[PDB]
């Protein structure tokens, strides 16, 4: 399926690229294709809590 990597960790918003390379940006309470809604976004440790209860991170090797 489609996996998003957080590309710019910021308070409030979030910039993401996909496994396909599709670029996007979101806010705290919004919708995301492939995960539904958004539950929690924090700049602490780069965690995005999706509506599916999953933790979107960035790329593993881009660390």
């Amino acid at each position: 399926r489609i996996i998003y990597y957080i590309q710019a960790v910021i308070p409030g918003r979030a910039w993401l690229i996909g496994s396909n390379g599709s670029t996007l940006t979101v806010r705290e309470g919004s919708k995301i294709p492939g995960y539904g809604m958004v539950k929690l976004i924090d700049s602490l440790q780069g965690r995005i809590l999706t509506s599916s209860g999953q933790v979107i991170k960035f790329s593993q090797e881009d660390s």
């Binding site: 710019a8 960790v9 910021i10 910039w15 670029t23 996007l24 940006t25 780069g46 881009d62 660390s63």
Partner: protein, 242 residues
Amino acid sequence: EVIDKKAFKDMTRNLYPLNPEQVVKLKQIYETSEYAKAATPGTPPKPTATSQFVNLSPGSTPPVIRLSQGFVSSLVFLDSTGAPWPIAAYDLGDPSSFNIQWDKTSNTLMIQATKLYNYGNLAVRLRGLNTPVMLTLIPGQKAVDYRVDLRVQGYGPNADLLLHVLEGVPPPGSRRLVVSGGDARAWLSNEKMYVRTNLTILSPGWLASMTSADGTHAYEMQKSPVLLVSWHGKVMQLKVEG
């Protein structure tokens, strides 16, 4: 005269109040102090170079640029053909946070951040771009892009692997197979073996082959388990395993 000797001892003592051992001790203490001075919390971002494609759609989100405080980051712009496209003008919001160095004929831009979590915006116009280039510059990140190579939709004023594998670069998508018998290197990516050596093959054959100035050779060859090698009139064999 023991009074005079004792006087010499105590004047030496008050002249040099520190022993050389304590001198080395405090020098080591100073070393620890300056190391704790240079010590920075957290972990540094990984230095990287990346390529991204810009989009001129009205609904397209503008790209971001990763920054680090006190570090030069380069932006280089390529067209649809990948050829460079020089800049005509630029304008950066808040030049307190970052500094730009730009010779007039260049297309590569340098950004050197001064703050940590203060982000800005930038507009770029190339030598032929009617449309502007809108970039969001963000410091304070876990990854630093040294060189951002940006592909653009337009075209400017301007519109193989054997060399790499003879220089010593292994081919992409390949793995080095274990070669038995002697000093040679070989890789397999798309079931065509690339061999880097300084020897000559006689029985299996080859399709293309380069040589270098220092004397080494690079062959491309369909794989076969047994290879015949000639060296100064000697005949030897090599075995490779699938």
